[PDB]
């Protein structure tokens, strides 16, 4: 029993964090094989962020200007490049601690663990979800750029996020491992705005499944609501609508508990309309939408990673 917000084992990823410096401005990078990925905004100084042009700044700079460090042992940059917002450095040695890896772009409502780094050294790890507005509610201070968001499937680490910038509302923004930002954001210190976020309904239902598995059942009403009928009520409360694919995603969770997916939506509907009534679900008095049905299974089935 017990249900926590869990981060993935950060072992394999810690082994890829390198420190990329450039005289005044330093940040973190990922060292997989003989490639070093680090946000392109490292080729800047305190004045270049105000209004940048990475297109030509990369051109006027070369291999020697980069200062890579694997803790203490500096690395030789033998090739520069710019795939969108990330900088592809080339090193004279493949990372001996490189895990089996994938590069994956995720959808909103999907989760990953973030290994927070400063000067190529990991300081902490936490579970995050791509909000439906493509921002993350992260915990990053200046110098946390480079820090990755990943997921572990079997023995293979799947990289999904690179930290680039913060927004004025305290929330965070970054690109995939190819440099394509998540959302309509650019890597500049310009007027940027997160926009209306919604609640990840598929993750809220999956969260209540973990509460049913862990004993909390008071909210389990014996009524039903059609899929569209639920989407009628849910949308009033700023909750992402439920697709039929979402129902298929909750299928295994439903089968493993006995409670139907359509029944669970009716238990959620009255939960939203009437409120908590003092009581808490899983120790919280708010609905947690940061648990995909997969994170619910991996926690409540002792799913380990090699």
């Amino acid at each position: 029993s017990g249900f926590r917000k869990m981060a993935f084992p950060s072992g394999k990823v810690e082994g890829c964090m390198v420190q990329v410096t450039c005289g005044t401005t330093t940040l973190n990078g990922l060292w997989l094989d003989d490639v070093v990925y680090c946000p392109r905004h490292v080729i800047c100084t305190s004045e270049d962020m105000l209004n940048p042009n990475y297109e030509d700044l990369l051109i006027r700079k070369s291999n020697h200007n980069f200062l890579v460090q694997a803790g203490n042992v500096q690395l030789r940059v033998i090739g520069h490049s710019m795939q969108n917002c990330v900088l592809k450095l080339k090193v004279d040695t493949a990372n001996p601690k490189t895990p089996k890896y994938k590069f994956v772009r995720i959808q909103p409502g999907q989760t990953f663990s973030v290994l927070a780094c400063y000067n190529g050294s990991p300081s902490g790890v936490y579970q995050c979800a791509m909000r439906p507005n493509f921002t993350i509610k992260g915990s990053f201070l200046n110098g946390s750029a480079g820090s990755v968001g990943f997921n572990i499937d079997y023995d293979c680490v799947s990289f999904c996020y690179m930290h680039h910038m913060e927004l004025p509302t305290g929330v965070h923004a970054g690109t995939d491992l190819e440099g394509n930002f998540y959302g309509p954001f650019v890597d500049r210190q310009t007027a940027q705005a997160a926009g209306t976020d919604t609640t990840i309904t598929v993750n809220v239902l999956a969260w209540l499944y973990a509460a049913v598995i862990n004993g909390d059942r008071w909210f389990l009403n014996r009524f039903t609501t059609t899929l569209n009928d639920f989407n009628l009520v849910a949308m009033k409360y700023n909750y992402e609508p439920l697709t039929q694919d979402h129902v298929d995603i909750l299928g295994p969770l439903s089968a493993q508990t006995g409670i139907a997916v359509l029944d669970m939506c009716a238990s959620l509907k009255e939960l939203l309309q009437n409120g908590m009534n003092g009581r808490t679900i899983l120790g919280s008095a708010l609905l947690e939408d940061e648990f995909t049905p997969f994170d619910v299974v991996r926690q409540c089935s002792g799913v380990t990673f090699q």
């Binding site: 962020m49 200046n142 750029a145 680039h164 927004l167 004025p168 310009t190 940027q192």
Partner: peptide, 6 residues
């Protein structure tokens, strides 16, 4: 208040 490069 503008965005912040980390």
């Amino acid at each position: 208040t503008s965005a912040v490069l980390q």
